[PDB]
Amino acid sequence: EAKVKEMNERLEDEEEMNAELTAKKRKLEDECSELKRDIDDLELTLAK
Amino acid sequence: QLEAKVKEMNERLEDEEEMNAELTAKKRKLEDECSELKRDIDDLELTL
């Protein structure tokens, strides 16, 4: 009965850890998109 | 019955824990990529 409840809890935690770490990941995806455009557009005004 | 209940939870934990394992490995490379993109800028801005 114990290992049953214990594994229930961990499941809810892993299901939510999925959501959490992906919001962390996403913030880095967003950043890595933006930083690239800021690299590029700077050079896109610098270029000759 | 309680061992069956034990089983599909152990099993589903393995699915979940690997999704979560992926999200942190995906997270690593994105931290690293952000790193170098942030570099490319801060080097380049030292002439503006």
Q: How far off is chain B from A47, nearest CA to CA, in Å?
A: 13
- The answer to whether residues A21 and B21 touch, using CB atoms and an 8 Å cutoff, is no
Q: Does B18 contact chain A (CB < 8 Å)?
A: no
Q: Does A39 contact chain B (CB < 8 Å)?
A: yes
Q: Considering only CA atoms, which of B18, B17, B12, B10 is closest in space to residue A4?
A: B10
Please state how this structure was obtained.
Answer: cryo-EM
Question: Which amino acid appears at position A7 of this protein?
Answer: M
CB contact under 8 A, A32 and B34: yes
Q: What are the φ and ψ backbone dihedral angles of B46, each rounded to 5 degrees?
A: -75, 40
- The answer to whether residues B18 and A14 touch, using CB atoms and an 8 Å cutoff, is no
- The experimental resolution of this structure, in angstroms, equals 20.0
